[PDB]
């Protein structure tokens, strides 16, 4: 049964996930491996996420460093697992998104797959989003088909919910097509605030949020954002959720304590998920939570509250650690590419139809 | 007998070349197609070849336009030839280079291969240079292996010379492995000068050059470069000596290219019976005169004489490179590129 590596750096950017799966009758996780990303690499990536000078050269240099790190992680994992590269059929590389502009019909992942193949000695499948975009799609999210393969059940209406930077839900309804969409903010505003305020990369354990007090007025002005009304195919904020967007809202209201702002941001995520989810699937029996936000104890409470009809739990309860779900999916996408099975869900992305996603860079 | 399309921007960025080959026991050219490149697109590509603002967004939009054009040409060619896309195994896409810095270990060719796959319904193999550069190579030139496969001969010592911007040669000597290097400027300076002077893209048939007179003081100053190439570099050399007629500089520029070719080529392959010229410089009658004289003991002619039109050489090589990818055969000559060893070049974007 073939083995794959999945390689990603998400939108949180503290490091690189590497997973090893076996794709037999089902997808089995064999091993996991996390590397820290140097702070400099994280900032240089974030410096490419907004328009700037000399981007071609800058991106090429950044991408060399990102690939070097990935290959390093792959080497460490294989050695530690007593495995040779020849035991791995392919790497599925998510790359690093520096610009996602589906409305301008483009998405940009860097991560020089050719150099990744050179360094690793393993075939690499990368560049998964662009075929979806070329076919009129949003290029995202790409995890629903994997989610469906993992948790596709006729006996239960399930929502698979990834809380990364942004929140995306896969709606698995018995006797129906797979639906899904980015619900909006996950950790990203909470990351942005504690970063601006104190220089921390994220709010660990949602602790600083926990200390604060939700501001019902500010929350109402955030949830007032028209974005939430937008339905159907949607990816990574139809209103780019950022700190300039937040600060604009803050000034209008009275001066609030930072901790309260953090508590409000937490409630915003909880609320926007609940309502974007139940609106599309009121029948939801189970919410399977993955991504970093699955660790946020407070956030996980509020989801359970706001969705009383559904059982809300980490994917750990269904035998898949939440930290590794996205990487496992990119390993799976490498499999789908090699088998010429469709990677996208056209009803999720809004593409014209099913497509083979990715490109093969052979070792 | 698989069939492949080869795609690339043409000479002087005035259009796109598309070729259809059959890869049997040898490479056969079935058909050729040329599409003009809009002036906007040409200038927008050139505006990305130097560092500037908002490149990632600008490059995304330019490559959408470039891929739309390529696909338009593919469609035109296939209908005109009464062929289905299902008859073509793959497109080999050269893409469009906007930045080539092997010194900094990168090379950047745009051309959204997935969009091309989407629009043509044909598998695309692209991004040929990056694996060679990943392996410590220069990522160029990639045609030596093709030239060997095409015009390899046991009896004749050949030089296959491509005169694009720069003049790269493939030295085909019986019994020996293929060699290659850049002989200095091809059309790059001659295009740059008439562009600066008159806003023309190129000097057609080297007519303007042929109206002028060579300047020794300049020619010698130019040939004194330790390489033995751009507009500022030329104007620096111009400013030393006194005012000179534009046609004479253009004449001088033409001779610089001829001499650097003649001298470098004969230096590396003294026993050169035949020089097979291809690319845009092949149609520079004036330059082809001088080359014949400055290499008197060799037969100097375009690849037309040996069965393949000089215009389509490069496109045919990229179709060939799609073949090498799918067969998992090496596409580089690591002795020419400086790569660590043989590598399969490119990446497959399936329809
Ligand atoms: Cl995704
Ligand atoms: Cl080349």
């Amino acid at each position: 049964m073939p083995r794959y590596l999945g390689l990603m750096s998400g939108t949180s950017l503290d490091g690189m996930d590497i997973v090893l799966i076996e794709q037999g009758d089902r997808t089995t996780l064999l091993a996991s491996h996390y590397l820290p990303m140097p702070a400099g690499l994280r900032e240089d990536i974030l410096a490419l996420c907004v328009p700037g000078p000399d981007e071609i050269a800058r991106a090429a240099e950044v991408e060399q460093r990102w690939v070097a790190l990935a290959a390093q992680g792959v080497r460490e994992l294989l050695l530690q697992q007593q495995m040779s590269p020849d035991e791995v059929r392919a790497i599925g590389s998510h790359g690093q998104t520096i610009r996602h502009e589906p409305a301008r019909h483009f998405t940009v992942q860097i991560g020089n797959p050719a150099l990744l193949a050179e360094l690793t000695g393993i075939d690499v499948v990368a560049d998964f989003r662009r075929r979806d975009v070329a076919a009129g799609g949003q290029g995202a999210p790409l995890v629903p088909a994997f989610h469906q393969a993992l948790f596709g059940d006729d006996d239960t209406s399930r929502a698979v919910l990834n809380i990364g930077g942004f929140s995306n839900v896969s709606l698995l309804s018995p006797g129906k097509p797979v639906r899904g969409f980015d619900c909006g903010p996950g950790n990203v505003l909470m990351d942005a605030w504690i970063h601006h305020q104190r220089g921390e990369h994220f709010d660990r354990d949602g602790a600083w949020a926990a200390s604060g007090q939700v501001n019902h007025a500010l929350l109402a002005s955030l949830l007032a954002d028209e974005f939430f009304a937008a339905r159907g195919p949607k990816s990574t904020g139809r209103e780019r959720f950022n700190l300039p967007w937040l600060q604009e809202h803050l000034a209008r209201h009275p001066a609030l304590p930072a901790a309260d702002i953090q508590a409000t941001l937490l409630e915003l995520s909880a609320r926007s998920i609940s309502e974007s989810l139940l609106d599309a699937q009121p029948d939801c029996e189970e919410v399977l939570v993955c991504g970093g936000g699955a660790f946020n104890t407070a956030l996980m409470k509020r989801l359970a509250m706001l969705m009383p009809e559904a059982r809300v739990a980490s994917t750990d309860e269904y035998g898949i650690p939440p930290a590794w779900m996205e990487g496992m999916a990119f390993a799976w996408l490498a499999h789908r590419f090699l088998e010429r099975l469709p990677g996208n869900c056209p009803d999720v992305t809004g593409a014209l139809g099913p497509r083979t996603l990715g490109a093969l860079y052979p070792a």
Side-chain angles (χ1 to χ4, degrees), chain A:
Chain A
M1 27 288 122
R3 290 141 96 109
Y4 299 94
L5 281 166
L7 159 63
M8 56 158 358
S9 175
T11 330
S12 85
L13 280 182
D14 257 42
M16 217 156 287
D17 303 29
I18 302 166
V19 294
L20 176 78
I21 59 157
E22 195 165 61
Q23 191 55 44
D25 306 299
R26 304 192 301 183
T27 307
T28 297
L29 178 72
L30 289 185
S32 69
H33 191 74
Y34 172 78
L35 292 85
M37 171 155 310
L41 178 54
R42 164 178 171 276
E43 301 299 340
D44 281 349
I45 289 168
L46 288 177
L48 285 165
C49 291
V50 294
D54 192 34
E55 278 169 342
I56 298 313
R58 277 165 57 227
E61 189 269 353
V62 158
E63 126 179 291
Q64 287 171 351
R65 277 185 286 158
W66 186 99
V67 171
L69 183 60
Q72 175 201 320
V74 159
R75 171 170 164 290
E76 294 162 357
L77 177 65
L78 287 184
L79 283 172
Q80 288 167 11
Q81 293 305 113
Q82 302 181 246
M83 275 182 70
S84 82
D86 324 304
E87 296 181 64
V88 181
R89 199 186 161 183
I91 297 163
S93 174
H94 165 123
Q96 181 61 237
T97 297
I98 56 172
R99 215 74 57 77
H100 182 64
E101 298 273 290
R104 298 166 69 184
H105 306 292
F106 79 79
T107 197
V108 178
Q109 289 65 53
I110 69 181
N112 194 339
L115 179 64
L116 188 60
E118 184 64 17
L119 288 186
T120 65
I122 308 168
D123 293 3
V124 172
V125 189
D127 206 10
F128 292 103
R129 296 190 191 292
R130 282 212 285 178
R131 186 63 182 278
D132 185 271
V133 173
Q138 285 285 101
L142 293 194
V143 289
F146 183 51
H147 287 175
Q148 166 64 13
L150 280 188
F151 299 121
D153 182 6
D154 282 0
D155 306 313
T156 317
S157 282
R158 278 170 161 170
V160 184
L161 175 66
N162 175 256
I163 311 185
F166 300 75
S167 303
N168 52 290
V169 63
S170 311
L171 298 181
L172 308 187
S173 296
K176 305 189 201 172
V178 176
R179 286 160 305 125
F181 45 76
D182 290 12
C183 313
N187 284 305
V188 65
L189 289 190
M190 274 173 72
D191 281 355
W193 187 243
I194 194 177
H195 183 58
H196 165 78
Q197 193 73 15
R198 302 181 174 192
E200 306 295 68
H201 296 191
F202 60 75
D203 180 13
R204 195 180 199 176
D205 270 283
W208 181 45
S211 53
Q213 208 71 232
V214 170
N215 183 287
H216 290 237
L218 174 65
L219 177 64
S221 61
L222 289 172
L223 256 92
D225 192 56
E226 293 164 61
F227 167 66
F228 300 121
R231 223 67 61 190
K234 278 195 314 183
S235 68
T236 71
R238 193 187 66 134
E239 281 97 292
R240 181 85 201 134
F241 291 100
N242 47 47
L243 181 70
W245 180 75
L246 171 61
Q247 292 171 128
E248 185 172 352
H249 281 68
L250 285 186
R252 298 188 299 134
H253 293 64
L256 299 182
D260 289 358
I261 291 169
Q262 193 75 350
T264 297
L265 287 177
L266 187 152
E267 184 60 9
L268 171 75
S269 294
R271 283 283 295 286
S272 62
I273 292 166
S274 303
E275 295 170 4
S276 75
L277 194 161
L278 288 185
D279 175 58
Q281 193 189 73
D283 57 302
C284 188
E285 295 183 61
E286 288 184 292
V287 179
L288 311 206
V289 187
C290 48
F295 305 127
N296 186 312
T297 317
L299 178 62
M300 288 295 305
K301 302 192 206 299
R302 298 296 307 127
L303 289 196
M305 298 310 96
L306 292 180
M307 283 167 314
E309 304 300 297
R311 163 168 160 63
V312 174
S314 155
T315 54
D316 175 41
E317 316 305 2
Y318 306 70
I320 298 174
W324 309 130
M325 179 80 59
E326 270 191 290
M328 283 171 78
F330 275 91
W332 186 79
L333 277 177
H335 172 73
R336 300 286 287 186
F337 168 98
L338 289 171
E339 292 309 319
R340 300 299 192 264
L341 301 173
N344 62 344
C345 296
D347 284 349
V348 173
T349 67
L352 283 161
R355 300 294 189 258
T356 303
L357 302 180
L360 176 58
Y361 292 71

